[PDB]
Amino acid sequence: ASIKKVYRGMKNGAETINDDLEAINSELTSGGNVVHKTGDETIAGKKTFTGNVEVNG
């Protein structure tokens, strides 16, 4: 997620933090670079599943 840097004596201290927290939380539900439990997503790289895999589709 694209986040702004927090420093001492920042104009709008609380505002910047709120926007940073909302930007991170948005990626926890949809989009970004993380695989979600909901929605259609594309995954790249060697994924090694040590556990058991079940496909219903």
């Binding site: 001492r8 004596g9 920042m10 709008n12 201290g13 505002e15």
Partner: protein, 299 residues
Amino acid sequence: MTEHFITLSTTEPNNNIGIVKLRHADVNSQAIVAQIVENGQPKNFEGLQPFFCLMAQEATGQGVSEESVVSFDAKNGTLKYVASDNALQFVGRNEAYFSFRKQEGGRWIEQFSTRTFHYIVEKSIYSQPFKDSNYWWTFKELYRIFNKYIEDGKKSWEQFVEANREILESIDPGGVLLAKVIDIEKIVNEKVPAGFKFVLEHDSEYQPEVKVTSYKNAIGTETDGFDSGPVFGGGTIYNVPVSLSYDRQKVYVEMPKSYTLAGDIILIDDGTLLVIKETQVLCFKMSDAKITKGYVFVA
């Protein structure tokens, strides 16, 4: 909002059965949903205005408590009464019922009422008296006195300044001149860009726009640590009036003499620089260029 469902009768001799319990501090939420039934069938009170009648303990007379019900369906015999401040005033074990009258004007004609139901009100933090300054109080009492100290205090200060103004101001032919000058001297010290000059060195060959803001108790600048100040995340932000002067790779920012601050100069990664002296922060935001150095102007 919370609803309380009751099926009240006008024929069935209940007298006390049918409990409804609320509490003191419940402004406009706790509402009573009642079904009116006569001889096992719903009663149509068409043309009759419903009323919430309350028989309060140690507060009886001729009009103990009566409030008109606004939300109601007379065709099906249903009503919704939201408990008012008066209804919740009587903390304890009370009796209530619903009246229905076809009032013409002053004198009534037809008035039928439902059986009595128990209307009990539990105490709140607000209703319970608490000990303060070796005296017993309630919240509403102190809140009234404190707000009175604020209202009367400000009126007393407004008059103190006004009265002390007319002593020097009106009672003197040349005293007006003195007073006017101090006022102008302050407006020039605060609103006009005067006694304070700051230099901002940049990479650009042009004239970058600079915006200056002043604020106290900003994030991580408070005296007693983080979130110790009266206003979290910065107090009041003042847009500093500026008079811009430019040279090759140098910006001379002229500011009012009141915004004069000699503190630590902190340069951030981009077109932003801060001057921090304890809690007081002076912010410099530059567009289309990168700040390389910042310092107070010297002659």
